[PDB]
Design a protein around this ligand. Structure first.
Ligand code: HUR
Ligand code: HUR
Lengths: 298, 291
């Protein structure tokens, strides 16, 4: 199994740069609107004490330099939606793909297109941690890079990049500007909640092992969801939701292993350890492959 | 620090579907030529002379391109079409060296499916992710809007690793394009890349494996060969200079850390979240991402 990103071309065609004053970040150009982090308007003396909504009153359309490459897009309007700025431009992007804005749940994966000054630099897959951080690879100037999924040529944008935490993980918003997790867009050292293991993805990993014939961990036990969830928390595993049970349905049907039977198999692995054995060639359980990712590769 | 592929858009615009008889795979459309694995004509030289232009159905999305000529170059078929691809990037064909990395755009039925980074192994396989119908997917690097194509996909070995050709149709490794079970040579670990990745781990604040000891180059190499690692050359030492300059760790100091890692193991600890020594990041891969 590889971490595979989605092909990035439909998003590459949407990346622009937005400069206000001396600060440049990335923006997302869809139809005649450019989306970018609102703190592009911030000076060095703000950022610590964000006056963003009031800072915006002093700004006008002619203060924003939006560029596709070095071609300027004239801004004809602007507004703030939570932590994102929306700049109306006078040109509809001809490369606009079919798209949606979606808010993802912890455990879900998405492709990040890392960009600097409007120019795409690389692509890689990320997983939203239960503490609403991602293990990105972002440098100075990355803000406004986006994360996305592609289903039947429709691009679901789910992430825009804002911040690196002191611990080196990353935090951001959806495309309506609402942060994932308890972070704010201030120049300020913030702490995430203690992370946990993504149980639904570990289960998907065990299904992937079964599909490939590695199934020694299957047992003759089952569990209720409540009993499992209470044991899971004692090992710093996430509790399962009904939605988690539901997205494991296709893999359960494919292997003939009930979800609750697979939970009981994981419960044993958690209480008794791996006994030095391996699963898919590893003593470590992987929790960054979703059920959809597993069927994608199998 | 993450395994990072190049943005695939310039390549996606070149992928097409090629069908001949009951066989369908992917092709690469550059200017007015489509490049694809020659065995698209199989259900090859006597078999190709018996084919006509119209036996080939080439599709770019919905539109069909008209084949007006064809030639074979080694294991690649070159189909001349009557339409030029307007999205053709500036490009080059290159044959990569073992240990170098590239991005793969896995495609099915002419449609791009996923992108990920691979290394050309010392035994000239690659550890990819390819299914039925992935043949003709390509590997590439991007340098200032210029796409260097280096790989076209042909085969999956019984061990699950993969084999293919350069864009001249010459295989990497001792493989042939036949429906047979083929074994590769014994693989080794790319030493210069493991060292690059250990430097990456230092740049990202991971230091538990550093030590005070040092080693000579020959003594390191004696241990390296013992653990089935490739020799480290003075040119590799030179190539690691910048990363040594940034971190202030001499290359042979890092070699001493790798030697102890090899003789002692990691003791359950991890490096950049990995429990295994990683050898698919080149020194350039570390540099271009960390700066
Ligand atoms: C004492 O303050 C700290 C203490 C401990 C850890 C800390 N982290 C951050 C923090 O992340 N700040 C945000 C910015 C805030 C406003 C959301 C920020 O720099 N975002 C970057 C992406 C960063 C950069 C490095 N790789 C990461 O991904 C980004 O692109 C932006 N650059 C600018 C530059 C000027 C104006 C707007 C923006 S937005 C501050 C901080
Ligand atoms: C006794 O035979 C074996 C025994 C033990 C291991 C084996 N491996 C292979 C083997 O790899 N064959 C080649 C094809 C040969 C001709 C190069 C092949 O199937 N390539 C695939 C990609 C494959 C498929 C699975 N994932 C991989 O990446 C591709 O797309 C192509 N498909 C066809 C189908 C029909 C005609 C042309 C092509 S070209 C055969 C084999």
């Amino acid at each position: 199994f590889r971490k595979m990103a989605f092909p990035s071309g439909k998003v590459e065609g949407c990346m622009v740069q937005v400069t206000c004053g001396t600060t440049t970040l990335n923006g997302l150009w869809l139809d005649d609107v450019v989306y970018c982090p609102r703190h592009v308007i911030c000076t060095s003396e703000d950022m610590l004490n964000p006056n963003c909504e009031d800072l915006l009153i002093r700004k006008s359309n002619h203060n924003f330099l939006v560029q596709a490459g070095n071609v300027q897009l004239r801004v004809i309007g602007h507004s703030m939606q939570n932590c994102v700025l929306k700049l109306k431009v006078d040109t509809a992007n001809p490369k606009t793909p079919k798209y949606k804005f979606v808010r993802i749940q912890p455990g879900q994966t998405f492709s990040v297109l890392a960009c600097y000054n409007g120019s795409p630099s690389g692509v890689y897959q990320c997983a939203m941690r239960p503490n609403f951080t991602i293990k990105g690879s972002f440098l100075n100037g990355s803000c406004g890079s986006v994360g996305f999924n592609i289903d039947y040529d429709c691009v679901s944008f789910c992430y825009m990049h804002h911040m690196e935490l002191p611990t080196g993980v990353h935090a951001g918003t959806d495309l309506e500007g609402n942060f994932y997790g308890p972070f704010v867009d201030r120049q300020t050292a913030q702490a995430a909640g203690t992370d946990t293991t993504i149980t639904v993805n570990v289960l998907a990993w065990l299904y992937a092992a079964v599909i490939n014939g590695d199934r020694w961990f299957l047992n003759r036990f089952t569990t209720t969801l409540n009993d499992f969830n209470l044991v899971a928390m004692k090992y710093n595993y996430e509790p399962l939701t009904q939605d988690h049970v539901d997205i494991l349905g296709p893999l359960s049907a494919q292997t003939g292993i009930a979800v609750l039977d697979m939970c009981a198999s994981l419960k044993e692995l958690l209480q008794n350890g791996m006994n030095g054995r391996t699963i898919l060639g590893s003593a470590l359980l992987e929790d960054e492959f979703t059920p959809f990712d597993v069927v994608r590769q199998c």
